[model samples]
Every structure is written in C-alpha cells, then in structure tokens.
Target: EFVEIGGPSEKTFKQRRTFEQRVEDVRLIREQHPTKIPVIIERYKGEKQLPVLDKTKFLVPDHVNMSELIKIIRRRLQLNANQAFFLLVNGHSMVSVSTPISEVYESEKDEDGFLYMVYASQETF
Candidate 1:
C-alpha cells in the first residue's frame, strides 16, 4: 500500500503549486542553466508497480537523448537492467527515446514552461 505523496487525492506537481509559482520556477532555472531543459517527472496516478521517485524535478541536458534520460532515472531508482519501465509525455504519448530532449521540450513543454513526464510499468503480476 503506497501512501500517495499528496494525500488521498494525489495532487500533481501542477496542482500542488500555483501557475505563477511554476512559471517563476522555470524562469529562474532556465536563466541559471541556459542549455539544460527544465523537467518535472512524476509517477502515473494509476501506476502500482514502479517505485515512487523521491525527487521529481530534473534539469536535463539539451543534448541528452531520451534513452539516456531513462537510464538516468533508472539509476536513481536503482532498478535492475531487466526491470521494465518507460516514460510518458503529458501522461499520454510515448515519445521516441532517440529524439533529443530539446526537441521534446519545445513540443511538449507545459503552459508554465516545464517539460512534464510520467513514468509507469505494466502490471507484471
């Protein structure tokens, strides 16, 4: 039984913070690291198989491939090589990992200007 990080309703990052706050957060980070893309990753609300990541915010390098992004996240979770998982863009579409982060950021960045990604795994049971 996982305790939802935001209580029973399980609020998303967007829901937890105000729109203005999120905009300013992105503006500051983008100013500090011009080349790195601002990203916010969260567990899919329906996911039950994957471990919840303690940290959600990431500054991905502009040149880093999506496959590398998966590797980085996997390392953070210390998942086994065979443990299957994948990232979702906007909680719906799965972008090709071969695509560069910059391109994905431009196309998928939220209104507040942060790229949103959700991670989930198929129920293996």
Candidate 2:
C-alpha cells in the first residue's frame, strides 16, 4: 500500500483553465456579485507545515481587511494561535494586513482578473 505525503504533482487551477475561460469566469462573477473579490487561494507547493484548505475559491467582500481574511483562513484550517500563517500575493510578496482585499486585487489580479494567493507557514529560507 502506498501512503500519501503532500498532494501529487498536478496542474494548478490557473494552469488547468484556459485564459479565455478564466477571464469569462471572472467577468461573470464581477457582473453578478459586483462588490466581492474573486480570489483563488492555493497551498504553497513547498509548504510542509500546513494542510491544504478545504476550499480554494472564495468570493471575499471587497471592503474586508486582510486581517479579517486571515482570520477566516485560520478558522478553516483550525490553526492554533501559535502556528505561523502567511499569505502571499501572486505567490511572491506579502501584503499589509490592514489593506483591503480590493486594493490587493486591483494591484495583483492576474490578466484573467482574479486575485491569486498562496498560503504557507514559513515565509523565508
């Protein structure tokens, strides 16, 4: 019997969707919701300390602060207070916790128009 470690190597959500499809998806979401941020949160491939979140897609309120988003993520993970949690924008830089998700979305949204995020425990080498 084989035991699983992390997840198997697979294409990311962006990788699996065509650019046109992704763009259309975001367009429709924005057209209907109008005020929410379309976000895709994925686990960092190198992350070994944290488990993958139960849901990868989230429609966050545009006005909600980053800290609030973190609170929701932590709750979903059921993380302990001491566990480190970090959210990276577009898989690179970390945004300020006080900034609203709309701001982050405006600056970091992909060409397809959805904000992308990856979460991890350890932030640096």
Candidate 3:
C-alpha cells in the first residue's frame, strides 16, 4: 500500500558521484544483473479496490488534524501509530494533502455506515 526509497545525493556522496552518475550506475546494475528467473512488475489496468473505501461515491472530508488523525487511522488500518503517522505525513495518496480526512471518510463510506466507519479516522486523529 505504501513504499519509500532513499538515495545518496551529491552532498551525501562519499565519492564524487553526481545524481546523473548515480542514476546511470543503477541503470547499468539493472542491465548486467544476473538472475536465474526473470522478474516481472505488474501494472494494474484500472482502479484497484481497497478494503477501506468505495470508488463510486468517494468524497473528501472537511477537517483533519494530521498529527492526531494519523494515530487513529493507523489503529484502524492495523498499523503502528508511528507507522501510520509516517504515512500521513509522507505517503502519497490519490487525494491531495490539503484534503481533509473527514472528506476522505465520507467518500469512502456508504450513508448507513458512514458514522460508524468515520470513527476509524477520528480515533486516529
């Protein structure tokens, strides 16, 4: 659901490697790497369903406090508080950062279950 990667930059480089050089090195590594079996990366053809939200009537929330909400969302998603917080601040969601979690909750839930489901995000906040 989430992923992060770090890379050495020019200032952090122990050797005098530029960003371009580092990219080239990675490209070469991939080209020459040996594997007994081929590796494949699959791309989904269309939107994929997630357990938390429905695609058809999704709506963004109006209010969300990042620090608190992250904690609550993590609990509902079965993630540790710290991990959830990390994603809240750093994860790339389809929605923009400015969007409120409340809207996200509304969009994801059906009318009958909205209040109950909304609790999940509220608790995290």
Candidate 4:
C-alpha cells in the first residue's frame, strides 16, 4: 500500500585543507541543489568554560520519582490507571535533575479515541 524513495547512500568530495576549503565544498553542494530548503551554518568555540552542576548529583530514585511522574502524566493527559501503568519508559539517558519526560510522553490517538504518549526533554550537556 505504500512505497518510499531513499536518497543517495554516499557522497564523495575531494580532500580539504582548511576551513575555507570545507566551505567551498558545501557551497558547491548548495549550488547543485538550488531548492527552497533552508540552509544553516554554525561554528562553535572549543570548550572554554567550566562545566556546570553534574546531573548524577540530582538523580531521583526511579521507583519513587517515576511513580510521581506517572501520576503527573495521568492527571495532565486524563488517562486511566491501566493505560498509565502500561505506558513504556523510553529513553532515560540523562543523569541530571531535569528528566527528559517530554520524549517519554509523545503519543498517538486511534480512530476509536485511544491515546498513546511518548516523552522527550532537553538536558544540559
């Protein structure tokens, strides 16, 4: 019922000697594909600042905090106990105080009005 078209698997370019050289390579690519897509170029300075508070120091116990978090979700989304309890814990990659609960709660709804949620969040690196 459906088909998908994939883009090229590999792109090749000549070796570059400097930042200017790399910019030229990107410029060529842009010239070749003059579509309406937006382009963004960014440069980051090396790690020159001291790190902030570590995440592990603020880690909450999974059993306790997770239960509270589920309650919050159920209250917000109006889900039943069975639906909330069956919700899956997706990614818990961060070790900081701010959990990426948003990514865990992303959801989809079916025609019959059944809902699903997944959550994700931003964390300090």
Whole-model lDDT per candidate: 0.85, 0.84, 0.32, 0.30
lDDT of 3 by residue, 46-105 (tens): 212212321211122235533444444445446543331233221233323445555544
Deviation of model 1 at 125, angstroms: 16
Looking at model 2, report the run of 10 residues with the lowest lDDT sum. Answer: 88-97
Which whole-number lDDT from 0 to 100 does residue 80 have in model 4?
52
Each candidate structure's count of clashing pairs: 0, 0, 12, 16
Candidate 1 residue 21 Cα shift, in angstroms, is 0.8
* Worst lDDT 10-window in candidate 4: 36-45
Per-residue lDDT tens digits of candidate 1, residues 49-84? Answer: 789898888899999988888888988988988987
TM-score on alpha carbons, each prediction? 0.85, 0.88, 0.22, 0.21
Model 3 misplaced stretches (Cα beyond 4 Å): 1-62, 65-68, 72-98, 115-125
Clashes of 4: 16
- The ten-residue window of minimal lDDT in model 3 covers 35-44
Put down candidate 2 lDDT per residue, 1-125, tens digits, no spaces.
89878666856888889999999999999999999999999888778899888877689998898888887888899999899989888556464568888888898899999888888896664
Report the alpha-carbon TM-score of model 3 versus the true structure.
0.22
Q: What is the lDDT of residue 34 in candidate 2?
A: 91
For residues 44-84, write the lDDT of model 4, one tens digit per residue.
11222212111111112223333455455345545454441
